[PDB]
Enzyme design. Structure first.
Site, PDB file in Angstrom:
ATOM      1  N   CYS A 268       0.881  -1.217   0.019  1.00  0.00           N
ATOM      2  CA  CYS A 268      -0.032  -0.058   0.072  1.00  0.00           C
ATOM      3  C   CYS A 268       1.042   1.337   0.180  1.00  0.00           C
TER       4      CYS A 268
ATOM      5  N   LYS B   8      -1.140   5.498  -5.836  1.00  0.00           N
ATOM      6  CA  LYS B   8      -2.326   5.433  -7.071  1.00  0.00           C
ATOM      7  C   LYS B   8      -3.245   6.568  -6.659  1.00  0.00           C
TER       8      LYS B   8
ATOM      9  N   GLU C  50     -26.854  13.275   0.448  1.00  0.00           N
ATOM     10  CA  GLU C  50     -28.171  13.276   1.433  1.00  0.00           C
ATOM     11  C   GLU C  50     -28.983  12.524   0.279  1.00  0.00           C
TER      12      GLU C  50
ATOM     13  N   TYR D 118      -9.795  -3.806 -10.338  1.00  0.00           N
ATOM     14  CA  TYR D 118      -9.838  -2.617  -9.867  1.00  0.00           C
ATOM     15  C   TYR D 118      -8.508  -1.836 -10.282  1.00  0.00           C
TER      16      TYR D 118
ATOM     17  N   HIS E 106     -27.904  19.498   3.384  1.00  0.00           N
ATOM     18  CA  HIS E 106     -28.017  20.165   2.132  1.00  0.00           C
ATOM     19  C   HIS E 106     -26.942  21.149   1.901  1.00  0.00           C
TER      20      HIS E 106
ATOM     21  N   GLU F 271      -8.218   1.345 -12.464  1.00  0.00           N
ATOM     22  CA  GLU F 271      -7.489   2.570 -11.613  1.00  0.00           C
ATOM     23  C   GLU F 271      -6.755   3.294 -12.253  1.00  0.00           C
TER      24      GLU F 271
HETATM   25  C1  LIG Z   1      -2.001  -1.092  -6.950  1.00  0.00           C
HETATM   26  C2  LIG Z   1      -2.526  -1.678  -5.791  1.00  0.00           C
HETATM   27  C3  LIG Z   1      -3.636  -0.438  -5.032  1.00  0.00           C
HETATM   28  C4  LIG Z   1      -4.210  -0.900  -3.989  1.00  0.00           C
HETATM   29  N1  LIG Z   1      -4.989   0.127  -3.318  1.00  0.00           N
HETATM   30  C5  LIG Z   1      -5.948  -0.083  -2.499  1.00  0.00           C
HETATM   31  C6  LIG Z   1      -6.416   0.798  -1.788  1.00  0.00           C
HETATM   32  O1  LIG Z   1      -6.802   1.817  -2.359  1.00  0.00           O
HETATM   33  N2  LIG Z   1      -7.268   0.538  -0.504  1.00  0.00           N
HETATM   34  C7  LIG Z   1      -6.911  -0.793   0.133  1.00  0.00           C
HETATM   35  O2  LIG Z   1      -7.312  -0.792   1.175  1.00  0.00           O
HETATM   36  N3  LIG Z   1      -6.144  -1.554  -0.335  1.00  0.00           N
HETATM   37  C8  LIG Z   1      -5.388  -1.592  -1.504  1.00  0.00           C
HETATM   38  N4  LIG Z   1      -4.550  -2.289  -1.950  1.00  0.00           N
HETATM   39  C9  LIG Z   1      -4.274  -3.506  -1.259  1.00  0.00           C
HETATM   40  C10 LIG Z   1      -3.338  -3.432  -0.142  1.00  0.00           C
HETATM   41  O3  LIG Z   1      -1.939  -2.852  -0.606  1.00  0.00           O
HETATM   42  C11 LIG Z   1      -3.054  -4.688   0.565  1.00  0.00           C
HETATM   43  O4  LIG Z   1      -4.327  -5.302   1.003  1.00  0.00           O
HETATM   44  C12 LIG Z   1      -2.181  -4.566   1.757  1.00  0.00           C
HETATM   45  O5  LIG Z   1      -0.809  -3.893   1.381  1.00  0.00           O
HETATM   46  C13 LIG Z   1      -1.752  -5.935   2.258  1.00  0.00           C
HETATM   47  O6  LIG Z   1      -1.111  -5.767   3.419  1.00  0.00           O
HETATM   48  P1  LIG Z   1      -0.079  -7.005   3.778  1.00  0.00           P
HETATM   49  O7  LIG Z   1       0.445  -6.579   5.434  1.00  0.00           O
HETATM   50  O8  LIG Z   1      -0.935  -8.124   3.882  1.00  0.00           O
HETATM   51  O9  LIG Z   1       1.019  -7.113   2.886  1.00  0.00           O
HETATM   52  P2  LIG Z   1       2.080  -6.164   2.274  1.00  0.00           P
HETATM   53  O10 LIG Z   1       1.787  -4.666   2.571  1.00  0.00           O
HETATM   54  O11 LIG Z   1       2.212  -6.540   0.748  1.00  0.00           O
HETATM   55  O12 LIG Z   1       3.691  -6.145   2.921  1.00  0.00           O
HETATM   56  C14 LIG Z   1       4.103  -7.470   3.073  1.00  0.00           C
HETATM   57  C15 LIG Z   1       5.706  -7.251   3.004  1.00  0.00           C
HETATM   58  O13 LIG Z   1       6.358  -8.273   3.316  1.00  0.00           O
HETATM   59  C16 LIG Z   1       7.383  -8.553   2.473  1.00  0.00           C
HETATM   60  N5  LIG Z   1       8.056  -9.742   2.621  1.00  0.00           N
HETATM   61  C17 LIG Z   1       7.567 -10.727   1.604  1.00  0.00           C
HETATM   62  N6  LIG Z   1       8.293 -11.645   1.847  1.00  0.00           N
HETATM   63  C18 LIG Z   1       9.278 -11.647   2.760  1.00  0.00           C
HETATM   64  C19 LIG Z   1      10.009 -12.438   3.390  1.00  0.00           C
HETATM   65  N7  LIG Z   1      10.401 -13.820   3.154  1.00  0.00           N
HETATM   66  N8  LIG Z   1      11.001 -11.726   4.419  1.00  0.00           N
HETATM   67  C20 LIG Z   1      10.740 -10.521   4.847  1.00  0.00           C
HETATM   68  N9  LIG Z   1       9.731  -9.707   4.004  1.00  0.00           N
HETATM   69  C21 LIG Z   1       9.052 -10.343   3.261  1.00  0.00           C
HETATM   70  C22 LIG Z   1       7.079  -7.828   1.118  1.00  0.00           C
HETATM   71  O14 LIG Z   1       8.024  -7.408   0.233  1.00  0.00           O
HETATM   72  C23 LIG Z   1       6.214  -6.530   1.572  1.00  0.00           C
HETATM   73  O15 LIG Z   1       7.132  -5.439   2.050  1.00  0.00           O
HETATM   74  C24 LIG Z   1      -4.023  -1.966  -3.357  1.00  0.00           C
HETATM   75  C25 LIG Z   1      -3.037  -2.868  -3.727  1.00  0.00           C
HETATM   76  C26 LIG Z   1      -2.467  -2.805  -5.024  1.00  0.00           C
HETATM   77  C27 LIG Z   1      -1.592  -3.653  -5.642  1.00  0.00           C
HETATM   78  C1  LIG Z   2     -27.553  32.752   3.143  1.00  0.00           C
HETATM   79  C2  LIG Z   2     -28.049  31.577   3.519  1.00  0.00           C
HETATM   80  C3  LIG Z   2     -27.543  30.169   3.284  1.00  0.00           C
HETATM   81  C4  LIG Z   2     -28.081  29.104   3.634  1.00  0.00           C
HETATM   82  N1  LIG Z   2     -27.648  27.793   3.446  1.00  0.00           N
HETATM   83  C5  LIG Z   2     -28.228  27.012   3.953  1.00  0.00           C
HETATM   84  C6  LIG Z   2     -27.404  25.476   3.679  1.00  0.00           C
HETATM   85  O1  LIG Z   2     -26.382  25.399   3.182  1.00  0.00           O
HETATM   86  N2  LIG Z   2     -28.292  24.371   3.971  1.00  0.00           N
HETATM   87  C7  LIG Z   2     -29.596  24.361   4.713  1.00  0.00           C
HETATM   88  O2  LIG Z   2     -30.158  23.113   4.788  1.00  0.00           O
HETATM   89  N3  LIG Z   2     -30.254  25.694   4.955  1.00  0.00           N
HETATM   90  C8  LIG Z   2     -29.417  26.690   4.418  1.00  0.00           C
HETATM   91  N4  LIG Z   2     -30.315  27.905   4.601  1.00  0.00           N
HETATM   92  C9  LIG Z   2     -31.349  27.762   5.418  1.00  0.00           C
HETATM   93  C10 LIG Z   2     -32.461  27.621   4.273  1.00  0.00           C
HETATM   94  O3  LIG Z   2     -32.453  28.442   3.002  1.00  0.00           O
HETATM   95  C11 LIG Z   2     -34.004  27.709   4.927  1.00  0.00           C
HETATM   96  O4  LIG Z   2     -33.760  26.697   5.909  1.00  0.00           O
HETATM   97  C12 LIG Z   2     -35.096  27.383   4.072  1.00  0.00           C
HETATM   98  O5  LIG Z   2     -34.932  28.122   3.100  1.00  0.00           O
HETATM   99  C13 LIG Z   2     -36.492  27.544   4.885  1.00  0.00           C
HETATM  100  O6  LIG Z   2     -37.601  27.436   4.049  1.00  0.00           O
HETATM  101  P1  LIG Z   2     -38.946  27.649   4.237  1.00  0.00           P
HETATM  102  O7  LIG Z   2     -39.938  27.033   3.176  1.00  0.00           O
HETATM  103  O8  LIG Z   2     -39.217  27.651   5.844  1.00  0.00           O
HETATM  104  O9  LIG Z   2     -38.897  29.262   3.868  1.00  0.00           O
HETATM  105  P2  LIG Z   2     -38.511  30.017   2.471  1.00  0.00           P
HETATM  106  O10 LIG Z   2     -37.292  29.232   1.797  1.00  0.00           O
HETATM  107  O11 LIG Z   2     -37.635  31.341   2.786  1.00  0.00           O
HETATM  108  O12 LIG Z   2     -39.691  30.346   1.716  1.00  0.00           O
HETATM  109  C14 LIG Z   2     -40.568  31.221   2.044  1.00  0.00           C
HETATM  110  C15 LIG Z   2     -40.961  31.844   0.799  1.00  0.00           C
HETATM  111  O13 LIG Z   2     -42.591  32.485   1.152  1.00  0.00           O
HETATM  112  C16 LIG Z   2     -42.641  33.777   0.606  1.00  0.00           C
HETATM  113  N5  LIG Z   2     -43.669  34.793   1.164  1.00  0.00           N
HETATM  114  C17 LIG Z   2     -43.332  35.422   2.339  1.00  0.00           C
HETATM  115  N6  LIG Z   2     -44.328  35.891   2.880  1.00  0.00           N
HETATM  116  C18 LIG Z   2     -45.191  35.865   1.810  1.00  0.00           C
HETATM  117  C19 LIG Z   2     -46.508  35.993   1.787  1.00  0.00           C
HETATM  118  N7  LIG Z   2     -47.400  36.907   2.494  1.00  0.00           N
HETATM  119  N8  LIG Z   2     -47.470  35.458   0.609  1.00  0.00           N
HETATM  120  C20 LIG Z   2     -46.840  34.650  -0.011  1.00  0.00           C
HETATM  121  N9  LIG Z   2     -45.536  34.325  -0.160  1.00  0.00           N
HETATM  122  C21 LIG Z   2     -44.711  34.773   0.812  1.00  0.00           C
HETATM  123  C22 LIG Z   2     -40.811  34.211   0.578  1.00  0.00           C
HETATM  124  O14 LIG Z   2     -40.919  35.433  -0.152  1.00  0.00           O
HETATM  125  C23 LIG Z   2     -40.462  32.659   0.141  1.00  0.00           C
HETATM  126  O15 LIG Z   2     -40.422  32.872  -1.203  1.00  0.00           O
HETATM  127  C24 LIG Z   2     -29.463  29.231   4.170  1.00  0.00           C
HETATM  128  C25 LIG Z   2     -29.952  30.351   4.436  1.00  0.00           C
HETATM  129  C26 LIG Z   2     -29.435  31.429   4.096  1.00  0.00           C
HETATM  130  C27 LIG Z   2     -29.963  32.912   4.251  1.00  0.00           C
END
Ligand SMILES: Cc1cc2nc3c(=O)[nH]c(=O)nc-3n(C[C@H](O)[C@H](O)[C@H](O)COP(=O)(O)OP(=O)(O)OC[C@H]3O[C@@H](n4cnc5c(N)ncnc54)[C@H](O)[C@@H]3O)c2cc1C
Ligand SMILES: Cc1cc2nc3c(=O)[nH]c(=O)nc-3n(C[C@H](O)[C@H](O)[C@H](O)COP(=O)(O)OP(=O)(O)OC[C@H]3O[C@@H](n4cnc5c(N)ncnc54)[C@H](O)[C@@H]3O)c2cc1C
Ligand SMILES: Cn1nccc1C(=O)NCc1cccs1
Ligand SMILES: Cn1nccc1C(=O)NCc1cccs1
Ligand SMILES: Cn1nccc1C(=O)NCc1cccs1
Ligand SMILES: Cn1nccc1C(=O)NCc1cccs1
Lengths: 587, 587
Positions: B149, B157, B570, B291, B565, B295
């Site tokens: 790894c 990778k 979500e 994989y 959101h 990859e």
């Molecule tokens: C290209 C690639 C990408 C991967 N990507 C991922 C990933 O994204 N996520 C993930 O979870 N897993 C991934 N894996 C898998 C991961 O690498 C292995 O599951 C993990 O390394 C296994 O660990 P290990 O301890 O069993 O052996 P290793 O990590 O292979 O270690 C064994 C070591 O023992 C040494 N050795 C061997 N024989 C002897 C000996 N006789 N005496 C002394 N030392 C010896 C070897 O040279 C080596 O250094 C990937 C594998 C590859 C090939």
């Molecule tokens: C800058 C900002 C960023 C935000 N970012 C996030 C975020 O990342 N994630 C998140 O979950 N929440 C976020 N929020 C909160 C989210 O916008 C509110 O929780 C959500 O919009 C509430 O929905 P509501 O239906 O209660 O009211 P609103 O969405 O405000 O809708 C009420 C509507 O009724 C209208 N209305 C008012 N009075 C009247 C009337 N008398 N007659 C008719 N229509 C009327 C209003 O003009 C409006 O159009 C953010 C808020 C702000 C201000």
């Protein structure tokens, strides 16, 4: 028990069919209803454990105990033979449309919650109207259907965040072998805004198409509830009229506050104006310390702006304060300036140059808590000092809907107000998290209870959040200080670690800035009370754990789950350093 | 059960102290052992359920029922007076260091599992050696301490994958308002390799420092087990000697396979060579469909390579085949060519130019599965056709360790081989998922059971994965086809949806390529049997849900949890379209 549920279901459903999956007579009725394009709810009594009892209780309404039984707005309509009689005599359409009211449901507010509620209710045959109107900002800004998130909230702000994140992607690319020169590249604000607004416009249009396709009436008009069933509407020509509805859903959201100081309304702006601003803000002061204030300051700085944040007391009041401080420290190390313990007392030096598409110029005067003076010039001043509803605009006091001291609607745990047919969802529902996915779930689940006989409530506990600052902050559950308050320090154990994203190694970024912790309760099998993470893609990291926390995850559940390598999130599966051990969390 | 556990713990631990947290006599003994720099395990009986029964069972070894009691390699040593007597007479060090064997633990192999086991054992006072040697590839490539790894796997990778992802970040940046011109930017392979190799060098060094700081002996030498307790070592001068150890852990991993065809070993390379290759590969053929193959072909294409993949039958055998097909179609639409249903029959046209840092030229001949012939020139040919152990190198057949038909070690559920003192972990443990976090957990948990009296086993079920193709693929649990085979098609329900990352809107990327599904068992409360997601940051998305699946999440647990959101993740919280319904999953 069962009899009280069935009485509530029959009284408020618009059109509902009591049925059985194995009954050919029920299929024949279902087939006729689809031909006539009559939408309705269906309850399959052979899918319910007490369907036998329910079917006997139906006789209390219809005088019969067989299936199928069709009801309309609380009235028994008929069995198989009777429904088919009405169809072949061309009487069924007029029967299913008979109502004491213009609409089964009027939604006041066309945003996150209101649009979700209206679309779900129409699916079960409720004749539905959605009202939406956007009162312009002080400088005249307005926008289309969809609410705060779509137009001036989550959607444009995360798009602008992504434009900011790309600045560091351009920097990183040189270290990974790409030939560009980051110091020769600049950003064009108006090109960005144009792209953001084009996407928002496609959302505005999509919502109008969705309402049309669901047979929902959309009125671009301001609504006012003048009695339990009467809504007075004012259209864009100031024509006033009244419409009536059986059920009313209040969903009108909030708008930004301004401080009561000279020049604030006249010469500053808010988030409502920022996301469509035609010129780059230039040198900018952000007044406030909410997540809105810090997210906006963050992306403006990454886009190359000269940005200062004026903080009255602390960052992110209500969030875990160790995490809030780390968020701000990162921002300050990457260019954002902070005026701490400071409030404003705004003078205009130059008017906005609408011809040449340039900002104006302002003099900001204020003072620190010890009395020393603040005085500096800025091209743009953004106020982010909280948001409030204005229900004395939606809601006549004589209707009897109870409000709390902050002007939000006091509701039961099924969103019912003090008036039996009136409900409230979204940001105006007192005491609930103010988030788009919460408003959507509340609106959908409520529509199902009103018009399809559902019983399930929205669960407002342990709802996860993410603050999209330059380094993102995700959380689910209690802050560390709230946990200690509730249970005492001796019953709280905290596991924590720094980490470094693998992407940051070749790019020569910071070793020990990203951070995560689990706040646990010792006496309850080390239950996870709160999860906190500062790092890239923190919302993607946090979301999945929110299901485990809902499920009651313990520290042992995290320990026995195996990590995915290489990721940031896997660090949660091998935490071992406690805060009480005093061992360093650095890696 | 209590008495056979204590027997096993005392016989196995190197130095262990039975203690209570409230005892000052215990404290005094701990500080004496700390001052003496004697490491040891500790069992606090005033924190265990049946601690009172264990306290009494200790008298079968020591004739005392009181606390503290310290043991060394199976022998009772004394109470608080007796231990300070040995310390005062300068007898303690000679007692704790007396052993029949050179080492309490010899680990053969210094990779993911072996280094983790060695460091954890040393924590409890086990005298430990770690042996590592890297046999060169056919062209002579070698590398430092840390395993597959670290040097030639997950770490390089994913760094190369990130270099590829940054090409599309450069493209997106124009749409978000940045002034660069992607079409005039190129990539330098040798600059990227130098940064990648410098990071790997820092990991090689970090592991050597870690072993030294834990008092672990590191031997850079090839190990061979010639009897249950004897390891023959051959150093860098082929000096041969023998060391002895009480417990043995085999952790030697696997190496790439070559097909049995002319020219393969001579003129092709594998992933072992790719990550330090000094020249850009140029026009490349990747042979295989694992994989690893996908990859590597993926990032080479994104860096600007002309890349072809030759596939014998299917992509990603053993993974969900709907998802595998989606992975491959994305790659084919974004530059990777595929020679489908095809195998190779390799000729050298030009030798590699080691002076001017240029690849050679090769002629590949093969045939398609009907009968047509394949013939094309490539500058580089990469084989990714599986991996295998070579335990004949490591293990004399006379020792008695049973292997399976693939050459992997057959073990119990606590990693024990057919020889009682010999254990195996990682990729050579037959039947286990071959992943780095699995090897690390196995090694750490095994060391605790051998030397600290632990009982907890490694849980190998529902281990989540991610394939880091250009569009990433994360999974936890069963494929859809395996669920249907196990439980029958009528007991399986599948919820699914396409989605579009918000980041892709302004960037004009594809509407309905990202995709996710939950495979559920109807008759078990709609339990989630398997989760699958194709999209950006898929490893961060998937990880948190693995905790919920470990705790037995149902569809209703996903439904009642609220989304964050705006995120990709979500979309899992509101899934509703079933495959059985036939409704389209598009957005
Ligand atoms: C290209 C690639 C990408 C991967 N990507 C991922 C990933 O994204 N996520 C993930 O979870 N897993 C991934 N894996 C898998 C991961 O690498 C292995 O599951 C993990 O390394 C296994 O660990 P290990 O301890 O069993 O052996 P290793 O990590 O292979 O270690 C064994 C070591 O023992 C040494 N050795 C061997 N024989 C002897 C000996 N006789 N005496 C002394 N030392 C010896 C070897 O040279 C080596 O250094 C990937 C594998 C590859 C090939
Ligand atoms: C800058 C900002 C960023 C935000 N970012 C996030 C975020 O990342 N994630 C998140 O979950 N929440 C976020 N929020 C909160 C989210 O916008 C509110 O929780 C959500 O919009 C509430 O929905 P509501 O239906 O209660 O009211 P609103 O969405 O405000 O809708 C009420 C509507 O009724 C209208 N209305 C008012 N009075 C009247 C009337 N008398 N007659 C008719 N229509 C009327 C209003 O003009 C409006 O159009 C953010 C808020 C702000 C201000
Ligand atoms: C006491 N309260 N505060 C806010 C909402 C309520 C409440 O109980 N509403 C339920 C109703 C049933 C019938 C008419 S209103
Ligand atoms: C293995 N495990 N499962 C749960 C907690 C632990 C643990 O003790 N982690 C050890 C380390 C993690 C990172 C460096 S050392
Ligand atoms: C040797 N030993 N001592 C105690 C328990 C065992 C044991 O079962 N060894 C592992 C096996 C692999 C295959 C068949 S048995
Ligand atoms: C609301 N909810 N909670 C769980 C499952 C559902 C549901 O039915 N999803 C409705 C939609 C999702 C996306 C577009 S419409």
């Amino acid at each position: 028990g069962t009899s009280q549920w069935l009485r509530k279901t029959v009284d408020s459903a618009a059109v509902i069919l009591f049925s059985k999956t194995t009954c050919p007579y029920c299929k024949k009725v279902k087939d006729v209803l689809a031909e006539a394009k009559i939408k309705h709810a269906t309850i399959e009594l052979d899918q319910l454990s007490n369907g036998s009892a329910i079917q006997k209780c139906l006789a209390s309404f219809s005088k019969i105990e067989t299936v199928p039984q069709m009801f309309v707005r609380g009235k028994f309509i008929g069995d198989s033979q009777t429904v088919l009689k009405y169809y072949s005599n061309d009487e069924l359409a007029g029967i299913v449309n008979e109502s004491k009211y213009d609409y089964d449901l009027i939604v006041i507010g066309g945003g996150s919650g209101g649009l979700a509620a209206g679309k779900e209710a129409a699916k079960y045959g409720a004749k539905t109207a959605v009202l939406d109107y956007v009162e312009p900002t002080p400088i005249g800004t307005t926008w289309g259907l969809g609410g705060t998130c779509v137009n001036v909230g989550c959607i444009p702000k995360k798009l602008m965040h992504q434009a900011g994140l790309l600045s560091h992607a351009l920097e990183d690319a040189e270290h990974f072998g790409w030939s560009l020169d980051r110091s020769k590249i600049s950003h064009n604000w108006s090109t960005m805004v144009e792209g953001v607004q084009s996407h928002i416009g496609s959302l505005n249009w999509g919502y109008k198409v969705a309402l049309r396709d669901n047979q929902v009436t959309y009125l671009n008009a301001k609504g006012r509830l003048i009695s339990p069933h009467e809504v007075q509407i004012t259209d864009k020509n100031q024509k006033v009229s009244t419409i009536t509805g059986n059920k009313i859903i209040l969903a009108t959201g909030e708008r930004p506050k301004y401080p009561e100081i000279p020049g604030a309304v006249e010469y500053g702006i808010t988030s409502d104006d920022l996301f469509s601003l035609p010129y780059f803000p230039g040198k900018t002061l952000v007044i406030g310390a909410s997540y809105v204030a810090l997210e906006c300051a963050g992306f403006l700085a990454s886009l190359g702006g000269d940005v200062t944040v004026m903080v009255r007391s602390i960052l992110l009041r209500g969030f875990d304060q160790q995490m809030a401080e780390k968020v701000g420290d990162y921002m300050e190390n990457h260019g954002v300036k902070f005026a701490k313990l400071c409030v404003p007392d705004i003078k205009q030096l130059k008017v906005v140059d609408t011809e040449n598409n340039k900002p104006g110029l302002l003099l900001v005067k204020g003072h620190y808590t010890d009395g020393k003076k603040f005085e500096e010039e800025f091209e743009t001043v953004i106020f982010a000092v909280g948001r409030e509803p204005q229900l004395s605009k939606v809601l006549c006091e004589t209707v009897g809907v109870k409000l709390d001291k902050n002007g939000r609607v006091v509701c039961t745990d099924d969103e019912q107000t003090t008036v039996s047919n009136v409900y409230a969802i979204g940001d105006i529902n007192a005491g609930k998290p103010q988030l788009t996915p919460v408003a959507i779930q509340a609106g959908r689940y409520l529509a199902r209870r009103l018009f399809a006989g559902a019983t399930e409530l929205t669960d407002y506990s342990n709802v996860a959040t993410t603050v999209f600052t330059p380094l993102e902050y995700g959380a689910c559950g209690l802050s560390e200080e709230d946990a200690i308050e509730k249970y005492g320090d001796k019953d709280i154990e905290v596991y924590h670690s720094n980490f470094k994203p693998l992407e940051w190694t070749v790019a020569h970024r910071e070793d020990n800035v990203c951070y995560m912790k689990l706040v646990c309760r010792k006496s309850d099998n080390m239950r996870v009370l709160g999860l906190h993470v500062l790092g890239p893609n923190a919302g993607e990291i946090t979301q999945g754990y929110a299901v485990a926390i809902k499920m009651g995850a313990t520290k042992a559940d995290f320990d026995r789950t195996i990590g995915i390598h290489p990721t940031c999130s896997e660090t949660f599966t091998t935490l071992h350093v406690t805060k009480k051990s005093g061992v360093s969390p650095i890696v």
